[PDB]
C-alpha cells in the first residue's frame, strides 16, 4: 500500500523506500512523478473530453517507428489493438480475393490481450478453460523457451527448431488458410522468455517463401524496453503490424495503438476505406507529451548507451548464487531461475510457490520483482540510474540467500 | 476544437450547439473544471492497482461503492475495463463460463437482436447486429445468434404497436425453440437501440420479454453503455423499463466522455458463482482499468447525483424536449418524432400518408446531418432517421435553440430534394 511514488520509488504506509524494478507493469519508462505529463492532462481536459492530440501524436510516431510504418490507428487499450490487428489482417486478405486466408498463429505463454479474441491468441492455457477461447483461426505452437523446452540442445540449434515449428504448422494447416503469425520479440507476461538468435532470423524466412504477415507484439516492448525504441529494430524485424500501448503514456494514461506497414495499409485504405480512427484526446495528449520527454532526455539513448549493458553483466553476476540457473538479459528486461540444483540441474518441484516466496520476500527487503513461476523477472524504467543498479542487485543477492535457507530448513 | 458547455466552438468563433453529446457519451456537458482537478490529482499518485501494492485512497473502491448507490438494488459487484466494447467481451466471458459452473457447458450461446450495437471488439462486432461490420472476414464468432428488432417503422409500420411489441417478443422465444432451451445462455439488448437509429420499443416489448426469460431458464444481459447514467431520464433505462438485469455493461456517461472507462454490474445471483470459484477467473486486467479514470469516473458521479442532474432530466428537461421534439413530426419530410427522455428521432420520408421511403435513405440523411452543422447543430443520421442525445446539463432556452435549428435543417433539406 504505496502513499508517495516518485522516480524509481514508492513508499508504503511505514516508509519504507521500495524501489520499483518492475515499473509497475513493464510501463512506466519515464519513472513516476512527471508532473509535466499532469499537466498537459488538465489542460487538455479544459480543452475537449471528446473529439488535436491526434495529429501530434501520429507524427512522433512515424518518426520513431521505423520502416514503412507511416499511419497508426489507436485505441483504449493493447488488449484492443490485437482485436483491430486480427480483423484488419483478415480484411487485408479478403481485399486480396483470399478470404479463406484468415488463421491467424500465435505462441504457447504468450500474451496478447485480456477481450476475448486477444485472450484466443494469448497462449496461457489458464485463460482458454473459462468459456470458449480458441475463436475459429487461432493456432499455437511451441515457445523458443530454452530453458524449459530443452535445456541441453545447443541453443544455436534449438532456436532454428522453435521457428520452424512455425513452418511445420504452416504445412499442417494450409498455407493458403494461414493468414498471419504473431509473437511477442520476447514473451513478457509469461517470465522473460527470450529466444535464441537464431529463431528471428528463421520466422523471417518462413514468413516470407509462406505468404504471411508478420505481426510483432511491442506492448511490453515498445517505447525502450530493449534499449531500442522497439524490440522490432532490436531484432531487425519489419513487422507488418505492431499493438504499442503500455509504453505510449509511460502508464499515466490508457491508450493502444496498432502501427501498420504500407504493404497492409495502402490495400485497407486504397481499394477499402470501409473498415472511426483515433483515441482520445485526453490521453493522446498525454502520450505525445511521454513521447517528447523520451526524446529530448533521450532516456531511451541512454536506456542503451549506459544503464542497459552495465544492468546486463550486473544480473549475470546473479547467476552464480546456489538458487540461481539461468540470467537472462536482453536491455531493460532480465530474468533469473529458481532451481534447487544447478550443476544435477534438479528443476525445482513446484518452482511456483518457491519464486512466490522469493517475490514475497523481495518487498521485505524492499524491493520490487515479479513471479512467474520458478523465475524471477525485472523491468526497471529507463530512468534508472548506474548507481540504482547496484541496490538493485544487493537487495536481489539477500533475497535469494534467504530463500536458499528458507526451503532448506524451515519446514521443508 | 474548443468545448464550454452545450457548445462547441471552432476555427471561424461558429457555436455549434452539440445535440450528440459528442457519442452519447458527454452527459455533464463540456468544461467541467472539476474534473480535470480529479485527473490532476490521481494522476499524481500510483498509475497502476496491483493486488500486490495499492493506493492511498483507491479510486475504484469510492466508484465501485457510488454505482452500487445507483444501480438496481440487487447489483452489487463492479469490474471494470478499459471501455465498454471490453465490457462486453467480459460480460460474454462471464455468462458462458457462468454456466460452466453450473454444470452446463452446452449452454453457451448468447442472442442478440439485428442492428444492435454492443462493441466494437471481435466480440462486440459479433454481438452487435450490423452486417456491415460482421462482413469483414467473419466477425459472426459462434455462440452468437440473432433475433429481429422491434422497429415498428422500418418493419411492420401499420401493425397495432401492443400487438406488434408483443409479436417481435415473441421473437426471442421462437429462437429458443430453434436453438434448445439447455443451449441458450442469455439474451442481450439495450433498453432503446442507440446508434442504430434510437429504436423505441413498443411499451408491450419489455413486457413480454422478462415473462420470456423467466418461463426459460436463461440470464439476462441489458446492455447500458448508451442508455446509461441519464439517457433515459432515470439513472439507467433498466429502472425506465422495469428490467432486472443479470449483467449489466456501464460506460460512455461512467466518465461523462471525460476518460476511458468501462464496467460490468453483476446481480447478486450470477455473483455468488463466479465468486466461490473465481481464483481461476484471474486475468490481467482484473478491475481497475486506471485508478485516474476511477478517480474521474467517481467525481464526475458526485457531480451528477449532488447538483442532481440525472433528477431534472427525467422531471424537468427531458419532457420538455419530448414535446418539442414532436412539433416537428408535422413537417413535410418529417413522418415520425419519436424519443424518450434524453434521445430522439426524427424519421425522414418521401411522403407522410403514402408512407413512401427514399430510394436509398441514407443519401438524405447525410444531407441533413450535413445541413445541420451548417445551421449550428450537431445531428447524427442512421440512414433517414435523424438522432439526438443532448447533454442532461441541457437548459430549456437551448431545446428552443434545438428545435429551430433543426426546422431550418428540415426545411432547407426538403428545398434541396425537390
Same mark, same amino acid.
Given at each position: 500500500?504505496?502513499?508517495?511514488?516518485? @522516480?524509481?520509488?514508492?513508499?508504503?504506509?511505514?516508509?519504507?523506500?521500495?524501489?520499483?524494478?518492475?515499473?509497475?507493469?513493464?510501463?512506466?519508462?519515464?519513472?513516476?512523478?512527471? $508532473?509535466?505529463?499532469?499537466?498537459?492532462?488538465?489542460?487538455?481536459?479544459?480543452?475537449?473530453?471528446?473529439?488535436?492530440?491526434?495529429?501530434?501524436?501520429?507524427?512522433?510516431?512515424?518518426?520513431?517507428?521505423?520502416? *514503412?510504418?507511416?499511419?497508426?490507428?489507436?485505441?483504449?487499450?493493447?488488449?484492443?489493438?490485437?482485436?483491430?490487428?486480427?480483423?484488419?489482417? /483478415?480484411?487485408?486478405?479478403?481485399?486480396?480475393?483470399?478470404?479463406?486466408?484468415?488463421?491467424?498463429?500465435?505462441?504457447?505463454?504468450?500474451?496478447?490481450?485480456?477481450?476475448?479474441?486477444?485472450?484466443?491468441?494469448?497462449?496461457?492455457?489458464?485463460?482458454?478453460? *473459462?468459456?470458449?477461447?480458441?475463436?475459429?483461426?487461432?493456432?499455437?505452437?511451441?515457445?523458443?523457451?530454452?530453458?524449459?523446452?530443452?535445456?541441453?540442445?545447443? &541453443?544455436?540449434?534449438?532456436?532454428?527448431?522453435?521457428?520452424?515449428?512455425?513452418?511445420?504448422?504452416?504445412?499442417?494447416?494450409?498455407?493458403?488458410?494461414? %493468414?498471419?503469425?504473431?509473437?511477442?520479440?520476447?514473451?513478457?507476461?509469461?517470465?522473460?522468455?527470450?529466444?535464441?538468435?537464431?529463431?528471428?532470423?528463421?520466422?523471417?524466412?518462413?514468413?516470407?517463401?509462406?505468404?504471411?504477415?508478420?505481426?510483432?507484439?511491442?506492448?511490453?516492448?515498445?517505447?525502450?524496453?530493449?534499449?531500442?525504441?522497439?524490440?522490432?529494430?532490436?531484432?531487425?524485424?519489419?513487422?507488418?503490424?505492431?499493438?504499442?500501448?503500455?509504453?505510449?503514456?509511460?502508464?499515466?494514461?490508457?491508450?493502444?495503438?496498432?502501427?501498420?506497414?504500407?504493404?497492409?495499409?495502402?490495400?485497407?485504405?486504397?481499394? @477499402?476505406?470501409?473498415?472511426?480512427?483515433?483515441?482520445?484526446?485526453?490521453?493522446?495528449?498525454? %502520450?505525445?507529451?511521454?513521447?517528447?520527454?523520451?526524446?529530448?532526455?533521450?532516456?531511451?539513448?541512454?536506456?542503451?548507451?549506459?544503464?542497459?549493458?552495465?544492468?546486463?553483466?550486473?544480473?549475470?553476476?546473479?547467476?552464480?548464487?546456489?538458487?540461481?540457473?539461468?540470467?537472462?538479459?536482453?536491455?531493460?528486461?532480465?530474468?533469473?531461475?529458481?532451481?534447487?540444483? $544447478?550443476?544435477?540441474?534438479?528443476?525445482?518441484?513446484? &518452482?511456483?510457490?518457491?519464486?512466490?516466496?522469493?517475490?514475497?520476500?523481495?518487498? $521485505?527487503?524492499?524491493?520490487?520483482?515479479?513471479?512467474?513461476?520458478?523465475?524471477?523477472?525485472?523491468? &526497471?524504467?529507463?530512468?534508472?540510474? /548506474?548507481?540504482?543498479?547496484?541496490?538493485?542487485?544487493?537487495?536481489?543477492?539477500?533475497?535469494?540467500?534467504?530463500? *536458499?535457507?528458507?526451503?532448506?530448513?524451515?519446514?521443508?
Amino acid at each position: 500500500i504505496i502513499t508517495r511514488a516518485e @522516480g524509481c520509488y514508492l513508499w508504503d504506509s511505514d516508509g519504507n523506500q521500495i524501489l520499483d524494478g518492475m515499473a509497475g507493469l513493464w510501463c512506466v519508462n519515464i519513472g513516476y512523478g512527471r $508532473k509535466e505529463l499532469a499537466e498537459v492532462a488538465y489542460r487538455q481536459m479544459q480543452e475537449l473530453p471528446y473529439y488535436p492530440p491526434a495529429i501530434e501524436l501520429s507524427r512522433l510516431l512515424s518518426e520513431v517507428t521505423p520502416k *514503412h510504418m507511416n499511419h497508426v490507428f489507436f485505441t483504449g487499450s493493447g488488449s484492443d489493438s490485437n482485436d483491430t490487428i486480427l480483423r484488419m489482417v /483478415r480484411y487485408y486478405w479478403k481485399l486480396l480475393g483470399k478470404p479463406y486466408k484468415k488463421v491467424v498463429i500465435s505462441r504457447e505463454n504468450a500474451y496478447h490481450g485480456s477481450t476475448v479474441a486477444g485472450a484466443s491468441l494469448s497462449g496461457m492455457k489458464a485463460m482458454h478453460s *473459462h468459456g470458449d477461447l480458441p475463436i475459429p483461426g487461432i493456432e499455437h505452437i511451441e515457445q523458443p523457451y530454452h530453458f524449459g523446452r530443452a535445456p541441453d540442445m545447443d &541453443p544455436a540449434e534449438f532456436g532454428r527448431q522453435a521457428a520452424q515449428a512455425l513452418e511445420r504448422k504452416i504445412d499442417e494447416i494450409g498455407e493458403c488458410n494461414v %493468414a498471419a503469425f504473431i509473437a511477442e520479440p520476447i514473451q513478457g507476461a509469461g517470465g522473460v522468455i527470450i529466444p535464441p538468435d537464431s529463431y528471428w532470423p528463421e520466422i523471417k524466412r518462413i514468413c516470407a517463401e509462406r505468404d504471411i504477415l508478420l505481426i510483432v507484439d511491442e506492448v511490453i516492448t515498445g517505447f525502450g524496453r530493449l534499449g531500442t525504441w522497439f524490440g522490432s529494430q532490436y531484432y531487425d524485424l519489419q513487422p507488418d503490424l505492431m499493438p504499442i500501448a503500455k509504453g505510449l503514456s509511460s502508464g499515466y494514461m490508457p491508450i493502444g495503438g496498432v502501427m501498420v506497414s504500407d504493404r497492409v495499409a495502402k490495400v485497407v485504405i486504397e481499394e @477499402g476505406g470501409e473498415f472511426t480512427y483515433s483515441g482520445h484526446p485526453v490521453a493522446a495528449a498525454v %502520450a505525445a507529451e511521454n513521447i517528447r520527454i523520451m526524446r529530448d532526455e533521450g532516456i531511451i539513448e541512454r536506456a542503451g548507451a549506459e544503464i542497459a549493458p552495465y544492468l546486463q553483466a550486473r544480473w549475470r553476476e546473479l547467476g552464480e548464487h546456489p538458487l540461481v540457473g539461468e540470467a537472462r538479459g536482453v536491455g531493460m528486461v532480465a530474468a533469473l531461475e529458481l532451481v534447487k540444483s $544447478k550443476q544435477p540441474l534438479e528443476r525445482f518441484e513446484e &518452482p511456483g510457490k518457491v519464486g512466490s516466496l522469493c517475490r514475497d520476500l523481495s518487498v $521485505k527487503n524492499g524491493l520490487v520483482m515479479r513471479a512467474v513461476g520458478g523465475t524471477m523477472i525485472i523491468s &526497471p524504467p529507463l530512468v534508472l540510474s /548506474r548507481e540504482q543498479v547496484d541496490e538493485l542487485i544487493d537487495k536481489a543477492r539477500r533475497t535469494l540467500d534467504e530463500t *536458499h535457507k528458507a526451503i532448506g530448513g524451515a519446514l521443508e
